[PDB]
Nucleic acid binder design. Sequence first.
RNA 1: AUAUUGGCGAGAGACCGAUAGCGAACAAGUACAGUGAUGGAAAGAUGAAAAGAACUUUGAAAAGAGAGUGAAAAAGUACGUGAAAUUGUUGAAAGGGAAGGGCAUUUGAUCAGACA
RNA 2: CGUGGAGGUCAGUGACGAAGCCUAGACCGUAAGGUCGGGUCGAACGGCCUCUAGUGCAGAUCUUGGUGGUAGUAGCAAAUAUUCAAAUGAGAACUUUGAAGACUGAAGUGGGGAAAGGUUCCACGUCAACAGCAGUUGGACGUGGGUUAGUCGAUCCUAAGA
RNA 3: GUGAACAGCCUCUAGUUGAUAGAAUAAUGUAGAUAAGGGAAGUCGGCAAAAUAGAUCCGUAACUUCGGGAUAAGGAUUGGC
RNA 4: CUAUCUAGCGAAACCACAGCCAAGGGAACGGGCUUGGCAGAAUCAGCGGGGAAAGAAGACCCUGUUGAGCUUGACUCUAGU
Lengths: 84, 62, 58, 50, 154, 52
Amino acid sequence: GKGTPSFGKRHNKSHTLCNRCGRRSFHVQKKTCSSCGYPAAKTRSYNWGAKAKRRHTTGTGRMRYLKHVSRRFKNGFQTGSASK
Amino acid sequence: ANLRTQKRLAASVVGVGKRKVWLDPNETSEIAQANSRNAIRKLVKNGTIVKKAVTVHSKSRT
Amino acid sequence: RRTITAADRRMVSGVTEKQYKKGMKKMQQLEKNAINTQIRREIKRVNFQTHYRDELLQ
Amino acid sequence: AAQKSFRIKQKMAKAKKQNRPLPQWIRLRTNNTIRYNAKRRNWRRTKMNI
Amino acid sequence: ARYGATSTNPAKSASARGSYLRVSFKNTRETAQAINGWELTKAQKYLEQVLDHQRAIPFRRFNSSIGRTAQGKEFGVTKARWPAKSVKFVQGLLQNAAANAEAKGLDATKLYVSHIQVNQAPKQRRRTYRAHGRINKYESSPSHIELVVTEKEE
Amino acid sequence: SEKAGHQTSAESWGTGRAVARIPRVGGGGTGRSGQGAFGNMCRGGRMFAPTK
RNA sequence: AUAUUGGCGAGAGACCGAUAGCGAACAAGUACAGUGAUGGAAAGAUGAAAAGAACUUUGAAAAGAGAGUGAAAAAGUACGUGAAAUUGUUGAAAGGGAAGGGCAUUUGAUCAGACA
RNA sequence: CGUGGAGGUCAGUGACGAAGCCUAGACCGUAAGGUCGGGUCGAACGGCCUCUAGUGCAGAUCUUGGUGGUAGUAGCAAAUAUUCAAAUGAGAACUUUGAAGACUGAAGUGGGGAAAGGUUCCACGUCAACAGCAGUUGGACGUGGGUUAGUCGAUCCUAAGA
RNA sequence: GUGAACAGCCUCUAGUUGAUAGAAUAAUGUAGAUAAGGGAAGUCGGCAAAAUAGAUCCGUAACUUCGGGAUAAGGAUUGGC
RNA sequence: CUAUCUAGCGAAACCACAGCCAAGGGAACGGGCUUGGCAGAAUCAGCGGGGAAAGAAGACCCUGUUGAGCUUGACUCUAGU
Ligand SMILES: [Zn+2]
C-alpha cells in the first residue's frame, strides 16, 4: 500500500525549530529554514508571497524601540532633565 | 467502593502479581483507608491481605 | 500541616463553590455549542477527497 | 520523548501552563467578551508541532 | 413559561416542562399521544406495565419498518413498542405535575391530562467515520416535553 | 479595494467531482477549504464591476 | 515646481453596514490543516440599571411549579426584534392507485352596507 | 410599479408605540404593487418634484448557512466467554472486592526500551459533554503532586558527507 | 510437556476477561463440515474442495551438462505391556 | 454469526411531483396525455422485472482553426563541438 500503511512509517522529522523565527521549518539535513534562511543574513521575503509579507513584517510584533521613535521626534530628540 | 490502587500497591509490596493478592471482602471500610504503602504492610500481617498460593503445575506424569 | 487549598485561594477572588459549579456548567456548554457548529460547517467540505481513485473501470 | 533537548521541554512547560480553563473572576469584569478559553488544547485532539 | 394551545383554565390546572432532554423525539411523541386524554391514576399504571412488557405503546406516525406485536390490539393497531426511556422521562413529569397540583390544592383523584406536546430540540452532534475515508453526522434527536393536567368538571 | 476577493489562491477542481466548476479554495483544517471564491456569486468574493 | 496603495498625525465622504466592507468590527493573520513552502476561517446586540431570579415545594440531580425583580421574562446569559423551510398539540375540512389548478354553482364559515 | 442612498417639500407620521414580521380579515389597481383593520414588537420612517446607483430572481451539477422524506431504517455480527453473591450508589449485563469458568501459552494479550507523543504518570473531587449502548468507571472534566546522577547517555572522536 | 523443532496443541509465572447486550431459531447469505451409487458427464478451464502427507526398510525409469532427475514412481510397517 | 423481534444508540446514497396496467399518437419503447381495463385505510419479511434506478459534464467516434508526451530527412532556431 501507498496510503494508510505508508502513513505508519512517518516517525523521523525532516524539520525542526528555527532560532530566528521559532516555527518548524529548519531542514536538518541541509540546515536552512524554508521561511527565513537562517545561515543566510537576509530574510526570505518574496513579492509573490504578499500574504507572507504580513505574517512576518514590521508591526506583527512588539516594536520595543520603534514604537518610541515618533514620540521622540515630535519633541526633537531632546535629552537632559524634564523641568522644575 | 474502589480498590484498584490498593490491589496494585499490595502486589508491588508482596512481590507476587496482582492476581495473587487476596483482599478480605468483609473489610472494605478498613482497606479503603490504605492510601499508602506502609499500611499495606500492617494489613498483610494482620491477615486482611493474603499472598495466594502458586497454582500447581505438577510434573509427575512427565 | 496545611492552611490553604485551591478552593480557598479562589475564595478571596470572587467565585465560591456553588458559583464555580454554575459557571463551569455554562462554560462547558458554550464550548460545546462551538463544536456542534464547527462539525456542521465542516461535514460538507471535509469528505472532498483530492485524488480519490474510484476503483472501477469495468 | 525520553531523551530530549531543553528547548522542547521549555515549550512543553509553556503548553502545560497554558492548558488551564478561564478563571471565573474574569467573567465578572465589567465589559468581558471572553466567555471561555478558545485556545484550549489537549493531547488527544491537536498535536502541537514542535 | 409559555405553553401550547391550552383549551382550559389556569385556576384548576398545573403544568410541567422538561427541556433539552436527551431522549428520542420519535419515540417520545408516541408515548405522549398514547396517554393524551387520560386520567393520571390510569396512565401511571399503564406506563409501569409497559416497562414490565405488558400493554405496549402504539406507534402511529413514526412506524416505518418496525415489527408487529399483539399488544397493539387494544388500540386497533398492529405495530407497538416499549420505549423505556421516554416512558421514564414522561413518568418523571407526571409526578412533578401531580406535586404541583397537590401544592395548588387540587384533588388528585379526578385529575386528567388535557394538553401534552412534544417538540424538536437542538441536535447534539457527533461524527461517525465511514468507508473510503469520509465523514458523516451521527447525531441525536432531543426533545422538549410539555404537559398540563386539570380536574374534570361537568 | 482592488485586491478585494483576490487575496486568495484558488483554482477549480473540475469535472468528475459533483460540485460546480467555480474556483474552490484548497487546504484543510477549517471550513473555508472547499468554499467558492473569485466570483460575484460567492461569499467572500468580489463584486461585479468593482467601483473604480 | 513632480511622484507616493508603505509609516506617523489630522480632516472629510450622494461609499459598505456583519453572507456586505480589508481575510479580520470580537483574545485574526488568531483557532486549525499541511513535513514545508503556504493555505486560512466562523463568531457583533439581554436591559436603563444585574435589579442575573431571595424564599417555599417535587425530584437523587439537572431542572420544573409557585414566588419575586423588571416598564417587558411574549428580554432569563441557549438572552433585541425573531421570518421561511421543517416540526408538535389543538381546532376545521376532505380523502376507493396520486395531490395541486381553470370556468360555473349548491352546502358551510367569514366579511360587507344601512340605502336610518 | 418597486429597492438602497442624495437635494428640495408636506412648519409630514411616531414611545398615547416608528420600522420589521404573522394575518384561507377588508379595499384599489388589468398587473407590477399599493392602502387599511387585528396581533406581535420596541425607535426611527414615510408621500410628492427631482438626482444617483453595487437597484427587483425559481433555476446557473450557482456560493454560504439551515432543515427535510429516506429513517427510529441499513446497522453497532472478525480477535473462542462469560456467570453468581455482596458493597457503593438515585440508578449496576459493563465499577470494586470475593468465588467460579476461560484465554494470550515465553517469535505472548508479560516485563523494559529507540523514534514519536507531551504530563496521558499518581492522588482527591466529579459526570453537562467524549467513551458511535449505558456508566457510580476512565488516557474524559476540575484542582494539585511528581522526573534528584563525578560513574547511565548527550557533551568528546571520526566515518559516508555538509 | 508432546515433537526433529522458538512448528501446531495444552500448562506454570505475569496479564487480561475489553470489543453493546437479551429472546427466538424463517428464508437468502459469510465462514466450517458430511454424503448413498457414479466419479469431471459440470465448466472456457478440474476454478474451488477431496485424497496423499510424517518416520523406518525395500525398490526407484526415460533423460542427463554425469553434478542430478528423486521424497521419482510403486509396496509393507508404525500402538500397549 | 448475521438477517428477523426487543431496550439503547442512530447515518447515507438518492429525490422536479410522485408512483396500477394494455393499446394509440408522440422526439419513432409513457408514471402523468387520449380511449379503455380497474380501483378501498394502515402495513411486515423477502425479492431483484422495472423506475431508459444511483454512480461520474462518455474513458470509443467527430468537431475545435484547444493542448500535451513522443519521432523524424516537416518549418524556424539552439547549448555544445
Ligand atoms: Zn526560520
